[PDB]
Design a protein around this ligand. Structure first.
Ligand SMILES: CCCCCCCCCCCCCC(=O)O
Ligand SMILES: CCCCCCCCCCCCCC(=O)O
Ligand SMILES: CCCCCCCCCCCCCC(=O)O
Ligand SMILES: CCCCCCCCCCCCCC(=O)O
Ligand SMILES: CCCCCCCCCCCCCC(=O)O
Length: 582
């Protein structure tokens, strides 16, 4: 148009426009007070309304990157507060904006946000709901500057819907609390994934990312033709690159665009994209991204026909090595919405490797007619791991299950910090509960979704505090082997047991008055320490000690002289145990 601002205003809306400006300035000027941003937002919104009235109004012709940078350079305490960043204001536009993205601190040292009391929250939500949510929106935003604004705005409304529904119920706490935990864990998962995708695109590069996107895209759109999938996979990769770079506008438009292309060419991609294409500008992308698979043609020929038999495979392969392989992926992927993307990539690689060691022999045709037989083992390893673990998750509850992992992993890498083995083994227990609830078909894709963030979160720690050469060998290894590596770790025999520290096994009557979360963490923490002390204890020996302890807790948090029962009955447990574990 004549005006970028007036244009954004009209199709975004006054409400969303204001929330986004706020979030935007918060991701850039992370040290200025809330009251300071609320003034800029008003300043900018009063301006946008000026252009909607007259596109010709002075400055309305400026580009959003220019108007934005211009306002940023209006902060007088910029040089003092941010210093080096104020230097950016001396460069003109192409450079300036590039300079800001640069001096943007990813994880700034601000205090951990504490969750106030449900009643104080609900009350703040009553007197002034907008400033209540705008303040926390501001707090979240400044702490996660690379978080996609529109997505942040999406969470905001789910938060308002919980305070609207829960602050009205008699049992507020029983209402509000489980949602805030859900929302919190969902936004944290959503954030790690984004930081995780940008990390891959960096380490391994385009090829690997494209391969990945092909299998995922063709899994969702099993009907779309390889031409469309190729198209999208290419446009997609262009998007992640720009969004990763952290430029909000260049990333928002790129997503809007591809969403439009996908909606216009809808009938050529998926049948389950209806609703998403009927939603507004600021939701189309997020909708489609979280969309469901389409029913596969099921009029599908087969794969051993075009990739194992048909001589002229090496012919079609040498002509264009990747498109052929991409054709394998697209073909194999769309026929298996139940395989994890990495499993699919694990197969395409196997195929690639075989094609390279057979198209260079006398009779190729009879060299690669055993490949599909080689897919068998690669497929069953993760399949068998699922049942096995989902079966055990039923035999015991979530809590009893996490204890099994605790004992299992502490034995693999005992060198790892106890508070780390506990958290890690806790999240895993959750991945098992969130996924084992699903039927066979949707299991593998689920586990991969979760395991991927957990396994990375766990690696980033070894990134700062290396402990084992092993855990470090899988963390560095390619993402397609970054999981089968951990499944392969064996009990450490080199490890030399720790020495008794009664304090680690001294439980004062505190536990009796602690929430489930605390009773467990306390018990689990000793469990790890127990295995670290006696790493050769059978699953039997160990079950015993855990038994004589389950009872103990009762006998002393259900009896009239708490504290004496912990000192007297305690010495009997340690004594007995010390000798049971011999
Ligand atoms: C986003 C918009 C503001 C939502 C306010 C949520 C309350 C913040 C509570 C702290 C987060 C937590 O630990 O659960
Ligand atoms: C200040 C200007 C903010 C413009 C933000 C527009 C983002 C629209 C979201 C499109 C999408 O779904 O990707
Ligand atoms: C945690 C619950 C255990 C689930 C088994 C993990 C299997 C992961 C399959 C993904 C892959 O193929 O790498
Ligand atoms: C911290 C110690 C590493 C924990 C390994 C987690 C890998 C989970 C994969 C499931 C499995 O095969 O056991
Ligand atoms: C040296 C041996 C001292 C004995 C230490 C006992 C530690 C066992 C903690 C296991 C907690 C199991 C959880 C539960 O029973 O609910």
């Amino acid at each position: 148009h004549k005006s970028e601002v007036a244009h954004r205003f009209k199709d975004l809306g006054e409400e969303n426009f204001k929330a986004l400006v706020l979030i935007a300035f918060a991701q850039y000027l992370q040290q200025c007070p809330f009251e300071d941003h609320v003034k800029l937002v008003n300043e900018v919104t009063e301006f946008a309304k000026t252009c909607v009235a007259d596109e010709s109004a002075e400055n309305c012709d400026k580009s959003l990157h220019t108007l934005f940078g211009d306002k940023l350079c209006t902060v007088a305490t910029l040089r003092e507060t941010y210093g080096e960043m104020a230097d950016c204001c001396a460069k003109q536009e192409p450079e300036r904006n590039e300079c800001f993205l640069q001096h943007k601190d990813d994880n700034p040292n601000l205090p951990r946000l504490v969750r106030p009391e449900v009643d104080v929250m609900c009350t703040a939500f009553h007197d002034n709901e907008e400033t209540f949510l705008k303040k926390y929106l501001y707090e979240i935003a400044r702490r996660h500057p690379y978080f996609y604004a529109p997505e942040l705005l999406f969470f905001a409304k789910r938060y308002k819907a919980a305070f609207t529904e829960c602050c009205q119920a008699a049992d507020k706490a029983a209402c509000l609390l489980p949602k805030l935990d859900e929302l919190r864990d969902e936004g944290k998962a959503s954030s790690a994934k984004q930081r995780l995708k940008c990390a891959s695109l960096q380490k391994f590069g385009e090829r690997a990312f494209k391969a990945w996107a092909v299998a995922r895209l063709s899994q969702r759109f099993p009907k779309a033709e390889f031409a469309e999938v190729s198209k999208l996979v290419t446009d997609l990769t262009k998007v992640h690159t720009e969004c990763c770079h952290g430029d909000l506008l260049e990333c928002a438009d790129d997503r809007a665009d591809l969403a439009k292309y996908i909606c216009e060419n809808q009938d050529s991609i998926s049948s389950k994209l209806k609703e998403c294409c009927e939603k507004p500008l600021l939701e189309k992308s997020h909708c489609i991204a979280e969309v469901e698979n389409d029913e596969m043609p099921a009029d599908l020929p087969s794969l051993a026909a075009d990739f194992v038999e048909s001589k002229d495979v090496c012919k079609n392969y040498a002509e264009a090595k990747d498109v052929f392989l991409g054709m394998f992926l697209y073909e194999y992927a769309r026929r298996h919405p139940d395989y994890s993307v990495v499993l699919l990539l694990r197969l395409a690689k196997t195929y690639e490797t075989t094609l390279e060691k057979c198209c260079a022999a006398a009779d190729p045709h009879e060299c690669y007619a055993k490949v599909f037989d080689e897919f068998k083992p690669l497929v069953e390893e993760p399949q068998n791991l699922i049942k096995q673990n989902c079966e055990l998750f039923e035999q015991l509850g979530e809590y009893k299950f996490q204890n099994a992992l605790l004992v299992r992993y502490t034995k693999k890498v005992p060198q790892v910090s106890t508070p780390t083995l506990v958290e890690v083994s806790r999240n895993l227990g959750k991945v098992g509960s969130k996924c084992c609830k699903h039927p066979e078909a949707k299991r593998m894709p689920c586990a991969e979704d979760y395991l991927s963030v957990v396994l990375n979160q766990l690696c980033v720690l070894h990134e700062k505090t290396p402990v084992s050469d092993r855990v470090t060998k899988c963390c560095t290894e390619s993402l397609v082997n970054r999981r089968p590596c951990f499944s392969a770790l064996e009990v450490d025999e080199t490890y030399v047991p720790k020495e008794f520290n009664a304090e680690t096994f001294t439980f004062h009557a505190d536990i009796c008055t602690l929430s489930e979360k605390e009773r467990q963490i306390k018990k689990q923490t000793a469990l790890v320490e127990l295995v670290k002390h006696k790493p050769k204890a059978t699953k039997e020996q160990l079950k015993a000690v855990m038994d004589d302890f389950a009872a103990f807790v009762e006998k002393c948090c259900k009896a009239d002289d708490k504290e004496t029962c912990f000192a007297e009955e305690g010495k009997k447990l340690v004594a007995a145990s010390q000798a049971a574990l011999g």
